[PDB]
Amino acid sequence: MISKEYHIDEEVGFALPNPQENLPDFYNDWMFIAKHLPDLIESGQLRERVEKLNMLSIDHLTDHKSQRLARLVLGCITMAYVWGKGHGDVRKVLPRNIAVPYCQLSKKLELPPILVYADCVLANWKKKDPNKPLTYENMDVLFSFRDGDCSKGFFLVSLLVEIAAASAIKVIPTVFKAMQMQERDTLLKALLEIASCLEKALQVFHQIHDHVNPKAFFSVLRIYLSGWKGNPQLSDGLVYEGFWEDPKEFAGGSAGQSSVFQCFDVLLGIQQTAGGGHAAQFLQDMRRYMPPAHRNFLCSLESNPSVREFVLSKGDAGLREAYDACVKALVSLRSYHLQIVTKYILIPASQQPGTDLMNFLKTVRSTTEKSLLK
Numbered sequence: 001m002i003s004k005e006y007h008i009d010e011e012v013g014f015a016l017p018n019p020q021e022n023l024p025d026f027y028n029d030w031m032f033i034a035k036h037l038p039d040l041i042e043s044g045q046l047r048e049r050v051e052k053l054n055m056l057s058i059d060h061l062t063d064h065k066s067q068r069l070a071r072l073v074l075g076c077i078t079m080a081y082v083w084g085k086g087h088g089d090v091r092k093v094l095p096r097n098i099a100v101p102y103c104q105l106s107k108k109l110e111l112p113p114i115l116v117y118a119d120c121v122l123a124n125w126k127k128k129d130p131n132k133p134l135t136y137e138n139m140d141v142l143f144s145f146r147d148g149d150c151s152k153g154f155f156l157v158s159l160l161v162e163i164a165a166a167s168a169i170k171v172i173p174t175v176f177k178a179m180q181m182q183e184r185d186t187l188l189k190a191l192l193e194i195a196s197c198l199e200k201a202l203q204v205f206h207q208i209h210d211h212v213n214p215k216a217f218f219s220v221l222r223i224y225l226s227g228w229k230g231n232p233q234l235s236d237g238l239v240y241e242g243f244w245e246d247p248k249e250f251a252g253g254s255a256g257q258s259s260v261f262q263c264f265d266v267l268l269g270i271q272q273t274a275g276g277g278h279a280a281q282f283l284q285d286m287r288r289y290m291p292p293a294h295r296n297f298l299c300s301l302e303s304n305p306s307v308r309e310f311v312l313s314k315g316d317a318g319l320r321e322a323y324d325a326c327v328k329a330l331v332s333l334r335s336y337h338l339q340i341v342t343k344y345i346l347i348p349a350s351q352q353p354g355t356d357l358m359n360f361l362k363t364v365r366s367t368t369e370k371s372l373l374k
């Protein structure tokens with residue numbers, strides 16, 4: 001058993017199970033905007049609309065799911081407001097009527113006031129048919145930015161990979177129990193199962209091509225996911241009017257915000273967040289952009305003993321082969337993510353009349369390769 005305090009689902013892992021679609025009536029003015037962003041942005045009514053909103057309390061967002069749906073709604077509106085039509089005409093100040101509730105809600109959920117992976121992937125989905133299984137074809141996102149933005153493809157394939165890797169997450173207790181009870185055969189079986197789920201996760205990742213378009217992604221969706229930390233477009237950051245007197249920098253959406261993106265590297269003793277390098281700094285900093293229960297989960301993995309030391313100590317080819325099966329699977333995932341960045345960011349950028357992400361991932365991959373045993 002993984003503790004329920006870590007918010008991990010048997011079926012969907014780190015994803016929020018059955019995310020709420022609708023808010024209470026008190027927040028109808030937020031939902032009218034968030035549900036109609038494609039029209040409200042393409043006609044320039046979005047910015048004016050947000051300015052005409054009253055400042056609403058967060059006291060009526062009672063349960064976790066409602067609070068998370070609101071974080072998604074406000075996060076998407078914040079991005080839509082800041083970036084507008086997404087042609088470099090930017091807002092350096094977020095209006096108090098939306099800033100105050102978003103910042104208060106954010107502090108309550110222990111997340112930064114900006115759209116993160118946990119919002120727009122982990123909570124931004126529904127099933128069409130509850131009886132049918134979790135396939136792309138039985139699924140939809142709750143919110144989008146623009147028509148043709150491929151948010152469905154981008155978020156749902158991302159989500160499907162998260163789900164696929166969650167099959168391994170439930171093996172992790174088996175892994176730690178087998179070490180302390182010195183159960184070689186159990187540990188071997190666990191590591192081969194983990195390798196198998198990450199192999200499946202990669203096959204799932206292939207769907208990205210079927211549902212996402214390079215032009216659309218680069219020109220449109222990338223812009224809406226962009227944040228304001230070390231971004232020339234908002235040099236000093238964003239002003240959360242009525243909450244902070246001074247502007248504040250926050251990072252945009254990133255796969256590094258996925259707890260699955262990190263947790264196996266941790267489990268397998270791949271010291272990604274050790275180094276003192278930019279990649280190690282980035283990964284650690286993104287733990288603050290994950291929900292608190294999830295970042296706690298990563299922390300408890302780190303506190304448990306080292307799987308890598310355990311395998312190394314034993315002089316056991318079979319265990320080393322199973323540990324390496326897992327390492328190989330992660331390498332492949334990194335390699336694949338790089339091909340996606342190449343097709344969807346590098347090449348489109350070149351046609352415009354990526355590099356930092358490439359170098360970031362090359363380092364992560366290289367650190368992974370160097371963790372192989374044989």
Ligand SMILES: O=C(Nc1ccc(F)cc1)C1(c2ccc(-c3ccc(C4CC4)nc3)cc2)COC1
Nearest residue numbers: 117158161225253254255260261330333337340
């Ligand atoms: O960028 C991505 N989604 C993304 C979504 C929302 C954002 F706000 C920002 C980004 C993509 C991606 C998806 C999964 C991984 C991934 C998941 C697990 C692992 C295992 C190895 C640990 N590896 C990779 C990497 C990227 C989708 O296509 C690119």
